[PDB]
Structure 1
Amino acid sequence: EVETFAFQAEIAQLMSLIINTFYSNKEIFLRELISNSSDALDKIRYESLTDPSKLDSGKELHINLIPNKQDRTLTIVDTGIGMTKADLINNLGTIAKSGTKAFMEALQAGADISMIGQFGVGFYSAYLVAEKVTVITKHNDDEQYAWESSAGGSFTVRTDTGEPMGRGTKVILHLKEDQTEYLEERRIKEIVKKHSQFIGYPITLFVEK
């Protein structure tokens, strides 16, 4: 079954601002999502030091970038801690509420959209380039879930019926028609080198056959 939820008022406001504001420096979405993945990887790595059985769901700690020109999708796969049903519906939304408020106040005070990460709401920069975002996730303590939103004030959460992941998160960016440059090998390499060169996990770009 598919459950539909309204985003927190502040989050819905941020999403509308990200989608409607004229801002050409859209490439920052990739460093924001890579940073989210890197943070999830740090979390599982740290937890595994006191409980090694937390890595029974996969020992490899990495990030994979998968562009798909046919489907017009850019997929970011990590083997991080993953997210529970509570994280997707309540927890992360509650955490994001305060940062979203602070970021929108900062934007009114002179700050630019690239500073989104300093407020811990960088995930939402995915909407600079994507018309729809699908998040497939698996945490050791819960089932595999699929979160999805095309903005408009709502998101859906369902138990994922697809291919089992083991542990981690897949962020599927259903790109806007004019944002296909982020599917080009050369462009992705340039973004990773400029903004994510010092990420402490291997970042593998999957080249299209």
Structure 2
Amino acid sequence: EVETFAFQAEIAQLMSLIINTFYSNKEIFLRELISNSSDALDKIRYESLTDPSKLDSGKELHINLIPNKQDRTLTIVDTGIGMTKADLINNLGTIAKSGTKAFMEALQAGADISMIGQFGVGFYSAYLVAEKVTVITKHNDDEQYAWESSAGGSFTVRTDTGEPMGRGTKVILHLKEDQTEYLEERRIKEIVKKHSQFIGYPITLFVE
């Protein structure tokens, strides 16, 4: 059973801007996703100080980057806090609406795409390089869900029956045809070194 939801207008506009604006420095998408993973890992870490039981779903806190040329996907996996169904449908868009308006304020008033992360909506930079984004996520006390969107104003949520995750998030980037460079090891390495070198969690770049 797949449910289909409309993005809030403001979020749909943001996604259209990202997809349509001429902007050659597409590589910033990876730092934004890794940053989001790091924040999610911080979050489970501090929540589990006043509730150790939140770590029963997994104690390891790390990030995997997994390229698959056969599927043409780049997956950013973390064991962070993950996201509830209530997050995926409502709470994320509630928070993102304000940060989206600030970001588009600055885009005309002293800014370029590369500061999208300072307004909490860096996730949507994924559409610089991905034609479709699939997000698998598992939060404590909720089930595992698959969120999916190829933009166009809508997204889907379903219960995930695939490989169970324990706790965390997988962002699966289905790369555009002309963006397979982000499957190449040298390229991913270069980008992580340039923009993500001081993240306080292990980042494992899988090979192949």
Q: For the residues of structure 1 that align with 2:65 and 2:90, how far apart are their CA atoms?
A: 28
How many equivalent residue pairs?
208
* Greater mean alpha carbon deviation, residues 139-148 or residues 102-111: 102-111
CA positional deviation for 1:194: 0.7
Residues 8-19 of structure 1 aligned to structure 2 (within 5 Å): 8-19=8-19
For 1:16 and 1:51, locate their aligned partners in 2 and report how far apart those are by CA, in whole Å: 41
Q: Deviations over 1:26-55 (max 9, x none)?
A: 010000000110000000111111111111
Q: CA RMSD in A?
A: 0.6
What is the SS of the residue equivalent to 1:170? strand
CA distance in 2, matches of 1:45, 1:135: 21
Q: TM-score normalized by structure 2? A: 0.99
Instruction: Give me the whole-angstrom Cα distance separating, in 2, the residues matched to 1:58 and 1:102.
Output: 36
User: Does residue 173 in structure 1 map to residue 173 in structure 2?
Assistant: yes
Alpha-carbon distance in structure 2 between the residues aligned to 1:97 and 1:193: 31
Unaligned stretches of 5+ residues in structure 2: none
TM-score by length of 1: 0.98
**How much has 1:93 moved relative to structure 2?**
0.6
SS of match in other structure, 2:135: strand
State the Cα distance separating 1:10 from its structure 2 match. 0.6
- SS class of match (2:82): coil
- C-alpha distance in structure 1 between counterparts of 2:148 and 2:5, whole Å: 11
Q: CA deviation at 1:109?
A: 2.0
Q: 1:189 offset after TM fit, Å?
A: 0.6
1:17-76 residue CA offsets vs partner (Å, 9 max, x unmatched): 000111010010000000110000000111111111111111100000000111110001
Determine the C-alpha separation between the residues in 1 that align with 2:81 and 2:110: 35
Q: CA deviation at 1:102?
A: 1.1
The answer to whether residue 132 in structure 2 is matched with residue 129 in structure 1 is no
Output one character per residue of 1:77-109: Cα deviation in whole Å (capped at 9) or x when no partner.
000000000110000110000111111121122
CA distance in 2, matches of 1:53, 1:109: 46
